[PDB]
UniProtKB/Swiss-Prot annotation:
This is Heat shock protein HSP 90-alpha. It comes from Homo sapiens. Changing E32A: Strong ATP-binding. Strong interaction with HSF1, HIF1A, ERBB2, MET, KEAP1 and RHOBTB2. No effect on interaction with TSC1. The chain holds residues 16 to 224 of 732 of the full protein. Molecular chaperone that promotes the maturation, structural maintenance and proper regulation of specific target proteins involved for instance in cell cycle control and signal transduction. Undergoes a functional cycle that is linked to its ATPase activity which is essential for its chaperone activity. This cycle probably induces conformational changes in the client proteins, thereby causing their activation. Interacts dynamically with various co-chaperones that modulate its substrate recognition, ATPase cycle and chaperone function. (Microbial infection) Seems to interfere with N.meningitidis NadA-mediated invasion of human cells. Decreasing HSP90 levels increases adhesion and entry of E.coli expressing NadA into human Chang cells; increasing its levels leads to decreased adhesion and invasion. Homodimer. Identified in NR3C1/GCR steroid receptor-chaperone complexes formed at least by NR3C1, HSP90AA1 and a variety of proteins containing TPR repeats such as FKBP4, FKBP5, PPID, PPP5C or STIP1. Forms a complex containing HSP90AA1, TSC1 and TSC2; TSC1 is required to recruit TCS2 to the complex. The closed form interacts (via the middle domain and TPR repeat-binding motif) with co-chaperone TSC1 (via C-terminus). Interacts with TOM34. Interacts with TERT; the interaction, together with PTGES3, is required for correct assembly and stabilization of the TERT holoenzyme complex. (Microbial infection) Interacts with herpes simplex virus 1 protein US11; this interaction inhibits TBK1-induced interferon production. Belongs to the heat shock protein 90 family. Residues 1-209 are annotated as: Interaction with NR3C1. ATP binds at N36, D78, K97, F123.
Amino acid sequence: EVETFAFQAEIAQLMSLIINTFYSNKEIFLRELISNSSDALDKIRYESLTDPSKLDSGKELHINLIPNKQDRTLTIVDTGIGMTKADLINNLGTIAKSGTKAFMEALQAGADISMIGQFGVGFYSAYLVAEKVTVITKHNDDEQYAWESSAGGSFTVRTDTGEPMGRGTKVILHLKEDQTEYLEERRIKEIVKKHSQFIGYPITLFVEK
Ligand SMILES: OCc1ccc(OC2CCOCC2)cc1
C-alpha cells in the first residue's frame, strides 16, 4: 500500500530551485546529510540518558557511507533516533516551511546554496546530485517506513518490507548520470575530510566489491 502526498508549495519551490539553479559546488550535499545524521544520533543519545531502554533497538551510534556503482546509489546510514510516520508526513514539512522561506529570502539577498543547512532544510541538497531519494527509517515508537521522491511536487510513503533496520535512517541517493564521481572512494574521502572532519560519531566509508 503506497500513499502519495503533495509537498507544500514552498518546499516544491525549494526543490525546483535546487534542481534548476546553476551551481557547481554540489559536494556540500554530503556535509548536509552527515550533519543531519549526527543530529539524529545526538537525539537518541540524549534520550537514552534518562531511558536506557531506548537503545534496546541498537547500542551502536554510527554513520555508514555505502557507494554502489552497479545500482548508481550512494547510501548514508545512521543509527539515530529515526522518524515516525507523523514526522515524514506532517512534522518535518511544517518546520521546513519557515526554514525554506528564510533560505529563499537569504538567497535573494546574496546568500548561496551552500548555506542551506543554516536554515534547517539541508536534506533537500540531496537533489543537487540525486534524481530520486529514498529514505528508509525506523523510530522506536513506530514501524519501518520508506519515503521516496523524484521531486515533481509529490512524495510517497509506504510501510517498508525490506531488511529490518533496528533503529535509524538510511538515505539512498539515486545519483544523476553525470554525478557518479560521488561513488568514488577518493572523492568521498576528500569531501568527508574537507567538510565533516569533526563529526562526533564514527563515519565508515564502505569499499566497493
Ligand atoms: O537521519 C537522516 C535524515 C534523513 C532525512 C531527513 O529528512 C526528511 C526530509 C523530507 O522527508 C523525508 C525525510 C532527516 C534526517
